[PDB]
Amino acid sequence: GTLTGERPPVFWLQGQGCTGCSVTLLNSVHPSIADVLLKVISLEFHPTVMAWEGEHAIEHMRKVAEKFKGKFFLVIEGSVPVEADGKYCIIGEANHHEISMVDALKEFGPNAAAVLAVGTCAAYGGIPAAEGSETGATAVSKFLGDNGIKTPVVNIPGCPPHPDWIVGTVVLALDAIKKNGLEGGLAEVVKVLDSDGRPTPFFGRNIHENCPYLDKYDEGVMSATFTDKVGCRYDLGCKGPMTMADCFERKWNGGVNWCVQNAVCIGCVEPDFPDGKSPFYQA
Amino acid sequence: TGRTTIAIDPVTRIEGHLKAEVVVENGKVVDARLSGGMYRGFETILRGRDPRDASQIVQRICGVCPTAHSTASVLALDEAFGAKVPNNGRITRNLIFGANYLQSHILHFYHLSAQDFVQGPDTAPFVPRFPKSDLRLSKELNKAGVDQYIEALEVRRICHEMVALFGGRMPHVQGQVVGGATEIPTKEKLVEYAARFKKVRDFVEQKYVPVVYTIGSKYKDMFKVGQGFKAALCVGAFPLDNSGKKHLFMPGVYAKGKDMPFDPSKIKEYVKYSWFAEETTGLNYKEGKTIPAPDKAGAYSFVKAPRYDGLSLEVGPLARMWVNNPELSPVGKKLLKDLFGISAKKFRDLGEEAAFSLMGRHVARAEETYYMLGAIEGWLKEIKAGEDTVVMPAVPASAEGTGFTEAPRGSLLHYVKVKDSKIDNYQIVSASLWNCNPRDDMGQRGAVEEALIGIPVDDIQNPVNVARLIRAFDPXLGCAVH
Ligand code: SF4
Ligand code: SF4
Ligand code: SF4
Ligand code: FCO
């Protein structure tokens, strides 16, 4: 990219998020986050990092949204809570009117080129939707469908995702759009999503079948303490068998470690995370 | 001039969802209300689970400070399980968590706060902004701020590599569990941690600490506002031996000009002005309850109102530095003399008024970052490559435990009660809960609400100092509400 190249507008809305999906993106090695922001996208609204604030920030987003109707990308971090008329997530106030996450997704969702549901919360509901919750935390695709909003959704799950999955999905989409235009390009993206809406380049391979400890699993050699790095981690709770992600290759944080080497996989990219992956520390 | 009432929602360049509403009269804030507008309910989500799951689930309170929640949770679980963490595991935990102090403070100053004082480049997300943003730096010093913001993006990423070396990944570590740390440090990985640490040290010493004092010297008026109650809490953090009695930050309370001991039984959480059922007001965390009431009249936040023996206290780097009164960094001593005419040797030599101020909180955070370098260096000398870091304790049928630590933003505790081998109750009292809470049942304001009183608003169309004050506290509303 270049400082003077074409960069599409992006709005990043946080619902019931922890900001970990934003932070993981800040960890991108290549391109660096500075290069993403200055050379790849135009991040017009993001509550954690943007200069302006309050109603002025909301109105800026609304002005860009009008100028780029049908053409902006909407990132969602966190789930969308529907209980109590949306009151469990208020994201702003303008014109003396509070704006819930429900309101915001009904406003901007219909007018986005595509919605990127970043993280397991946005993609699938995640921890806010897990047993014992009471906010009506809802995944992006379900919320949009329930409200008759047909805008395409791409899921980029993980808790958090790896930055390369986020940036890489953006790059996949922008390449398809460069070759085919917006509608043709998004059709090419949809062709490479799995049944859970995830791009098969990053999510098309199973952890366990590619794991360096697979021989130990097959031999029945299981570590009995976390610090035994020779044996398989299955008896300690590893969910690699049930998990579709490329962590075994890509690893984490500049390649310095990954969950299975360090401890166990908890299945964080899967639609049933956390409840279907729990308990974490026994098979 | 008369009254103007100003609402800011969202307050940006913080973590999470915050509305601030201030009443301005004659150019000064005279009242304030803070609203945490997003709730998830971790304390109810956790019930019924295998207690060991907590040290993963709780991290999702916050992707900025997950290591703090991991730490509080594993300490609570260690106590409840009777797990005796090996010495080398204690040190490994300190290396995992300490690296995120560096990350979080650097993120806060540069990526959240610095735009309060520095004009970024002419493209989103650095524009548009207030037309009169009160950006006072020379072209050269402004450019240094921008250049350092950009460099800090790489430095904070390197800090997360440090976390992940023994923590597995970050955000959301895998490497802390009940019983210790899941990965023994190897000699080779300790070399890799130290090499990254050297780069972070050089940035902190040469760029970050100097820039905070230098920018502060162009905003000397910002040491004269934001005092609030001038009352602080520290609960202790980073154990230095296996006794549980010695910590890098030792506990204490400071209020009404007096140092006092910290007794956790004096914590109560009030809810009159919070969206929780009225019959849950006033509970200590060992008996805490979380019953949302989003339609309750008069309430304005999902943050509970914690009070310490009735006192409204603040937490964070200023609180810890004030309570513990360490020596100032060499470069801080020098720049205080050169740029401010102040001769100081220890933190309290700044005086109460300047320490408990908008800019004083930024200075305290920079000084604390420097202080953490020495702690991490010590742990790198103390750790033993190859020595076991974990025990594997059986889950108890019935137990309770509390973990106390200091997150980057301030005091954090987790309490767990286990019954029938499952979580019966789990209560969290977090840092930004202490800072960003609403009024208590007697109408006494939270710490940031009170610190807003007196903030200057000489231009109601560009009321920049309201959120500047808020950002000095490094709010994290995901943490505050959970
Ligand atoms: S997916 Fe995980 S890391 Fe991302 S917002 Fe949700 S809890 Fe946070
Ligand atoms: S460590 Fe986990 S992913 Fe690897 S072989 Fe064992 S069960 Fe499978
Ligand atoms: S190894 Fe498992 S828990 Fe770790 S990031 Fe990959 S999918 Fe998530
Ligand atoms: N630091 C941090 Fe997070 C907050 N506030 C916690 O605890």
Ligand SMILES: [Fe+2]
């Ligand atoms: Fe709580």
Ligand code: NI
């Ligand atoms: Ni936090």
Ligand SMILES: [S]
């Ligand atoms: S943290």
